[PDB]
Design a protein around this nucleic acid. Structure first.
Ligand SMILES: [Mg+2]
Ligand SMILES: [Mg+2]
Ligand SMILES: [Mg+2]
Ligand SMILES: [Mg+2]
Ligand SMILES: [Mg+2]
Ligand SMILES: [Mg+2]
Ligand SMILES: [Mg+2]
Ligand SMILES: [Mg+2]
Ligand SMILES: [Mg+2]
Ligand SMILES: [Mg+2]
Ligand SMILES: [Mg+2]
Ligand SMILES: [Mg+2]
Ligand SMILES: [Mg+2]
Ligand SMILES: [Mg+2]
Ligand SMILES: [Mg+2]
Ligand SMILES: [Mg+2]
Ligand SMILES: [Mg+2]
Ligand SMILES: [Mg+2]
Ligand SMILES: [Mg+2]
Ligand SMILES: [Mg+2]
Ligand SMILES: [Mg+2]
Ligand SMILES: [Mg+2]
Ligand SMILES: [Mg+2]
Ligand SMILES: [Mg+2]
Ligand SMILES: [Mg+2]
Ligand SMILES: [Mg+2]
Ligand SMILES: [Mg+2]
Ligand SMILES: [Mg+2]
Ligand SMILES: [Mg+2]
Ligand SMILES: [Mg+2]
Ligand SMILES: [Mg+2]
Ligand SMILES: [Mg+2]
Ligand SMILES: [Mg+2]
Ligand SMILES: [Mg+2]
Ligand SMILES: [Mg+2]
Ligand SMILES: [Mg+2]
Ligand SMILES: [Mg+2]
Ligand SMILES: [Mg+2]
Ligand SMILES: [Mg+2]
Ligand SMILES: [Mg+2]
Ligand SMILES: [Mg+2]
Ligand SMILES: [Mg+2]
Ligand SMILES: [Mg+2]
Ligand SMILES: [Mg+2]
Ligand SMILES: [Mg+2]
Ligand SMILES: [Mg+2]
Ligand SMILES: [Mg+2]
Ligand SMILES: [Mg+2]
Ligand SMILES: [Mg+2]
Ligand SMILES: [Mg+2]
Ligand SMILES: [Mg+2]
Ligand SMILES: [Mg+2]
Ligand SMILES: [Mg+2]
Ligand SMILES: [Mg+2]
Ligand SMILES: [Mg+2]
Ligand SMILES: [Mg+2]
Ligand SMILES: [Mg+2]
Ligand SMILES: [Mg+2]
Ligand SMILES: [Mg+2]
Ligand SMILES: [Mg+2]
Ligand SMILES: [Mg+2]
Lengths: 147, 122, 257
RNA sequence: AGCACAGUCUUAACGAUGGAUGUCUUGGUUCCUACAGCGAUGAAGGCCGCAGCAAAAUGCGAUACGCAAUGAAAAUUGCAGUGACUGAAUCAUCAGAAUGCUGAAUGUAAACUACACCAAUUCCCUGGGAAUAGUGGUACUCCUACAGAAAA
RNA sequence: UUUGUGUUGAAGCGAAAUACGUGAGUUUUCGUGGAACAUCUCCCUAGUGCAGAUCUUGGUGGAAGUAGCAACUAUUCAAAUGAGAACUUUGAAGACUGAAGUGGAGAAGGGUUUCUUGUCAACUGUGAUUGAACAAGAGUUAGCCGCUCCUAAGGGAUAGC
RNA sequence: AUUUCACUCAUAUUAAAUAAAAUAACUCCAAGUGGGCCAUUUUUGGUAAGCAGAACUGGCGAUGAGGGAUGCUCCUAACG
RNA sequence: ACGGACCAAGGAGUCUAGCAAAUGUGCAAGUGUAUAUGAUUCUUUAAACAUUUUAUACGCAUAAUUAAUGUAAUAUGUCCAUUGUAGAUUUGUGGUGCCCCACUUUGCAUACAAUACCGGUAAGCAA
RNA sequence: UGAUGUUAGGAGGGCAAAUCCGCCGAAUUUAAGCAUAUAAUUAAGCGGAAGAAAAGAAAAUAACUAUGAUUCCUUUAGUAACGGCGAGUGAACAAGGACCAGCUCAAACGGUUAAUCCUUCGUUUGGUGCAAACCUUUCGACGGAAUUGUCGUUGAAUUAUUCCAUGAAUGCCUUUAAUUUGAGCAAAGUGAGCAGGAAUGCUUCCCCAUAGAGGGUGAAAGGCCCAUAGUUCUUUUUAAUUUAUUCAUUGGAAUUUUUCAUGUCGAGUCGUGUUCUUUGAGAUUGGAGCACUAAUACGUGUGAUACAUUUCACAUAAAGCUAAAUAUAUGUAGGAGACCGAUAGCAAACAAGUACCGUGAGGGAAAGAUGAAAUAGUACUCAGGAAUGAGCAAUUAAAUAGUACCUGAAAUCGUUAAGAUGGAACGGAUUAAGAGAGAAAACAAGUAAAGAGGGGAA
């Protein structure tokens, strides 16, 4: 809203806040990203260090749907269950839950965190990591591969 | 208008339509109210004023005077009554123009055309 | 917006330095007194505007759904406080209860005269008088733009199903109508003020517990919506201050300089 | 009957010149909705004409500010005139009739109202009786038929 | 959105005030004017505040009753008309052009300036009763004068490319 | 080295004096500047210059008041 | 040194895209109902209201690193939540006036360091 | 086989462009200079259509548990990639929606009989109009085109079950609900009083509303007028619903059974080399010129890095047609806005693309307002040649509203009065002397006697 703009405070002043000696002129240093590597070098180097040059191989026709893969850690793995359902399994001891994470939108199980001690759980997925699968085995569970 | 969107309620448009109306449409605009006695004999509430009718003046400096309409001027939107006159600076005599909506008419002059109108208007 | 290129439609150019005149572009030719005048520029007669207005100014805004619902809810609650309704300008010194629920026979009134009699008998005669006297002709250029009169806001009649209220309560100066399942904030808080006077029919009053999930029902209850909560349990701070527990922890009053 | 020096500058009151200010608006501007080409059966544009008294604009075309028909329906006017006791005075609609010279312009030409060839042409009564130098046709390219002639 | 002024005179404008405020400004009186005008209760919005840019458009000054109204030899006496005659008309004088003429007749260009009658708001850089100004009506007669026909330097087209 | 337990080293006059010492310390987003000049003392080039070039501090610029008749930079002294 | 004879009206940091910082608001491991569709929405309304009768549209966030095939965060002895110095708040005694000291208890935010683990590289082995 | 023909019947040509199709083709500018690059497959130039045009029924994707003609919206994504790898540039598949539709030639098969098509001339059935005209109709004759190829089938027979078209009369043609043109009808005061030239104002007394949108009327109107809410007729085109029947003939069409036959499938075209353009397309994405020039379905093409030998998937080039969802700075009609308010808004609120200027292509203004009414626009007298002035005379509520007419600022000038005045004038501080205005603090509550009003209570 034009009511609150800064320029209205300079309305009786001569130079509109831009200076007697250095004016407000039009493009006194170039246009856009003009002078990089010549007279804008310091800015480019201290704020965007790796900007110039190229590195790596080409990939000519990508097709990103071939490698799409969302992940989930073992922490959030008991939290997919309702709390009253989580209560029942921790009470009884000869039953365990079987969870299929692909039905929830995850493809690869990943292994950060701590599973509950002596509480078996069976997990279905497309890919597993080594540490995640070890942690699932240690508490008495099992991993299953699906496609 | 109020509830049909196919006609305008703009001041500009219908203030333009009033002052450039074709001569045929101006006679419907120049209408006057009927007296109580003529409102029982005929079911109608108002009629377009015609030449040889009789009227009573209800607003203006000449309120209360009665007479017979002698001329109708569709271009100036005014009527002229028989004994309501005026002096020019010369001394020549003319009529005073009255707007038909300032008037109630108390006696008609009927003929073939108005009969078929008063019949339908019942 | 303005016409796209107004004031720039000529073959004018500047005379250059010399000739002892300013360097603004000038219309060419001769034989008419338009020739040789200053052509375009925001300081010239017949020139262009500084920043010509465009049609791609962002005219509207997008508003979050939860905030809209929260505001409607907070605007219904304000409609139930006698002090707030009075301070908005409604003359209700003769009403009995401010929520003001009326039986379902209101929903099938059919003539304007009956609606006016109903309003008068409830105790709102001096308030329907405020509305009739308020019609005035506006000040300013709005009269040239189809904005002739200026009227004040009256009660808002809220119903569940319509058997004649719509047509009966029309035509009364200042009176609005609305159906319970489509409640509009632009009516409940005119111009941003709070405390509109509302008259509720009994069915309209009851549907209001289903709409907000106290009782559940398909295609009526707002899905998965939770009624908002407050950061204060009881806003009476001077009742807390005067309690014995707090008063026993204070310190003796001290002296100014 | 008498008394203020003149010029210059300052301030009040009443005026002159000029067209700001306020109020007004049959005009602009933008958005939304619907529909959509015209022409050799002569278009768009250009020129020339038409009223009782008639310059422009608007409307019309040798029937020329308007004819006929259909819906309303007494006036229309500066003067002069014209109209009923409803095909008439006026308004609207608009299907019939009429629509100058040009222009792609197309018989040959064009700062020409210049010059060709072919058919004389147009009415009224029901075979007669009249009038008029007046009317129509004639570019180039191409398709389907047809006609004869020629080569092979 | 709220709640207000006006034919018992709105907005605007001129001169002011024992008036308020440090200030930008509010508020009020008298006069003119003749139809609309606010909101400071709180909010929204913008083409929102001028001493200048050899700024843009319009209006007005000192200079100033000033510079100036000098080519082309030259005017005078009487009378008419008229409200009014140095520059309209008549008569008498003194002079000029001097056939390579402000004498006659055509072309290009102009388009009614031509004629008769009337007449002076503005114009005719002094006057003006004059006028190519203004108004109302008129006026251009061909077998033999020309165009129209012929071909020139040349232009435009046809067939083909 | 590091870690854990014991004992002990002036304070109220504060392990020397003085202190409108916390008006401190640290993050973020940005403006305007990047032609300077003058005076005392030190000092380079030049015969010298109201010439050119450096050092420490105070000023003019950005700043008016009293004095120096007058004066951007001197003396007193900085502003409801 | 340049512009300015006088007066009135006009006259110059704005709009859109894209990013960030600051601040206000809502919800929170989630958040934003896209294009559409629905409705006893239809002067206003081109607004407002709704969401398909153990629930996979899409964006940003919830996981990094490498040119890359790829790989992917203490670890099952305990649902426990790595270590130390200073430090807000709390617990129990005593001193001078709820405050400040002394001892004791707990140990937020944060600052400075240590350690373990994930991706790349080097080294030592290496089916 | 060319040509000829004022032979009969017909077509093309020019204007207009906002959206659409085809060609041709810059520089300014950015890179802080500049040549590739950018501007841009843009502006200018030349051709061709429609209410839309173009595109379009796989020689397409993918790599999956697979999708399935074209177009457009939300995303993919400022991503893969291009680039003096600088400045800068920049797509496709999957996913969610709108809409939704498929077909014809060529080639194969039909020879006890081209089945096919067109011009001209007749004639024959039912409807609609006042008329003008217009629908519907199957019969024939002469003439011509075509075997240098029109028409039918869509591989050809046989079995059963079912569907379609085609003629006869008494045969019925009823109600309702929507969708659009044009007409008619359409409540309630012209009541006191004040002031006014004139109420639509103020104060009181009534009322109507399915109508309190807007405009007009001598000042602001729900009840004065047109219209407005509503309702009744009328004109289109379209859904149901209501009714068949008994008899006749010839042709077609889908599957289901038994058999045979294994066909055809677009050439100086594709492709390769080379040159120039264009693209995100990189040992080359599309197009084009020149040279060379294929195979026959077990073939040919695509699967984003140049080769040789192979596996696998997908599709079937070199002929044609097609509605919807999409666009619209043009023309015409309708509605509307937190838009401008006569130096503003279109150049133009008015005899505006007009007056006027230029040899020409072209350039292009200024200019709105008396009053309610002029059906009130200035009668009469005196002075003066006139213009004009004055009045005891005159319209209006008003002429200091007199047509150059609402209001009527500043610059600049006139008249009267009061002051100042030795080579500028104004000004800051502080007082004095004059002149003009002023009582809201700049004195007096109350008591008493009248006189004139205005309220409250029992
Ligand atoms: Mg400053
Ligand atoms: Mg400056
Ligand atoms: Mg500088
Ligand atoms: Mg000069
Ligand atoms: Mg303009
Ligand atoms: Mg105003
Ligand atoms: Mg004197
Ligand atoms: Mg066409
Ligand atoms: Mg013509
Ligand atoms: Mg008849
Ligand atoms: Mg008739
Ligand atoms: Mg010709
Ligand atoms: Mg000639
Ligand atoms: Mg040709
Ligand atoms: Mg005001
Ligand atoms: Mg008035
Ligand atoms: Mg401005
Ligand atoms: Mg100015
Ligand atoms: Mg002189
Ligand atoms: Mg002379
Ligand atoms: Mg001589
Ligand atoms: Mg001589
Ligand atoms: Mg001689
Ligand atoms: Mg003459
Ligand atoms: Mg004469
Ligand atoms: Mg003269
Ligand atoms: Mg003349
Ligand atoms: Mg001759
Ligand atoms: Mg020749
Ligand atoms: Mg100083
Ligand atoms: Mg001295
Ligand atoms: Mg300079
Ligand atoms: Mg100057
Ligand atoms: Mg101004
Ligand atoms: Mg934030
Ligand atoms: Mg590892
Ligand atoms: Mg081994
Ligand atoms: Mg450059
Ligand atoms: Mg540059
Ligand atoms: Mg250059
Ligand atoms: Mg172009
Ligand atoms: Mg064409
Ligand atoms: Mg098409
Ligand atoms: Mg897309
Ligand atoms: Mg992204
Ligand atoms: Mg390239
Ligand atoms: Mg590009
Ligand atoms: Mg889809
Ligand atoms: Mg064939
Ligand atoms: Mg009204
Ligand atoms: Mg009404
Ligand atoms: Mg093929
Ligand atoms: Mg390129
Ligand atoms: Mg692929
Ligand atoms: Mg094809
Ligand atoms: Mg096609
Ligand atoms: Mg409009
Ligand atoms: Mg204008
Ligand atoms: Mg009056
Ligand atoms: Mg007025
Ligand atoms: Mg002197």
């Amino acid at each position: 809203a034009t009511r609150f703009k800064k320029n209205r405070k300079k309305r009786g002043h001569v130079s509109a806040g831009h200076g007697r000696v250095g004016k407000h002129r039009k493009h006194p240093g170039g246009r856009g990203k003009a002078g990089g590597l010549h007279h804008m070098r310091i800015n480019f180097d201290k704020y965007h260090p790796g900007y110039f040059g190229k590195v790596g191989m080409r990939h000519l026709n990508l097709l990103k749907n071939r490698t799409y893969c969302p992940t989930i850690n073992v922490d959030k793995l008991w939290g997919l269950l309702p709390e009253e359902k989580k209560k029942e399994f921790s009470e009884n001891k000869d039953i365990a839950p079987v969870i299929d994470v692909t039905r929830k939108g995850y493809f690869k199980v990943l292994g950060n965190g701590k599973l509950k001690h002596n509480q078996p759980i069976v997990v279905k997925a497309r890919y597993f990591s080594s540490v995640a699968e070890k942690k699932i085995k240690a508490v008495g569970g099992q991993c299953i591969l699906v496609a | 208008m109020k509830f049909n969107k196919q006609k305008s309620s703009s001041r500009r448009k219908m203030r333009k339509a009033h002052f450039t109306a074709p001569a045929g449409l101006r006679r419907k605009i120049m209408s006057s109210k009927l007296s109580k006695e003529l409102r029982l004999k005929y079911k109608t509430r108002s009629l377009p004023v015609r030449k040889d009718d009789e009227v009573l003046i209800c607003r203006g400096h000449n309120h209360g005077r009665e007479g017979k309409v002698v001329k109708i001027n569709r271009k100036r939107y005014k009527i002229y009554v028989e004994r309501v006159t005026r002096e020019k600076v010369n001394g020549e005599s003319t009529f005073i123009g009255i707007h038909p909506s300032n008037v109630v008419l108390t006696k008609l002059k009927v003929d073939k055309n108005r009969k078929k109108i008063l019949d339908r208007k019942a | 917006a303005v016409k796209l290129g107004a004031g720039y439609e000529t073959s004018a150019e500047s005379w250059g330095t010399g000739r002892a005149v300013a360097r603004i572009p000038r219309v060419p030719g001769g034989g008419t007194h338009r020739a040789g005048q200053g052509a375009f520029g925001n300081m010239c007669r017949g020139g262009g505007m500084f920043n010509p207005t465009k049609i791609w100014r962002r005219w509207g805004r997008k508003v979050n759904l939860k905030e809209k619902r929260y505001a409607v809810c907070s605007s219904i609650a304000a409609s139930g406080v006698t002090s707030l309704v009075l301070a908005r300008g409604h003359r209700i010194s003769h009403l009995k209860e401010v929520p003001l629920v009326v039986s379902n026979d209101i929903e099938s009134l059919s003539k304007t005269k009956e609606a006016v009699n109903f309003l008068v008998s409830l105790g709102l005669k001096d308030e329907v008088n405020r509305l009739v006297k308020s019609k005035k002709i506006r000040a300013g250029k709005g009269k040239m733009r189809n904005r002739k009169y200026k009227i004040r806001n009256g009660p808002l009649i809220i119903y569940e199903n319509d058997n004649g209220v719509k047509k009966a309560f029309r035509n009364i100066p200042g009176v609005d109508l609305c159906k319970v399942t489509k409640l509009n904030l632009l009516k409940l808080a005119p111009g941003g003020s709070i405390g509109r006077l509302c008259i509720w029919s009994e069915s309209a009053f009851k549907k209001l517990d289903v709409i907000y999930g106290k009782i559940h029902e398909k295609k009526v209850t707002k899905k998965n919506y939770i009624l908002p909560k407050s950061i204060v349990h009881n806003p009476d701070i001077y009742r807390i201050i005067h309690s014995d527990k707090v008063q026993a922890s204070l310190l003796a009053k001290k002296k100014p300089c």
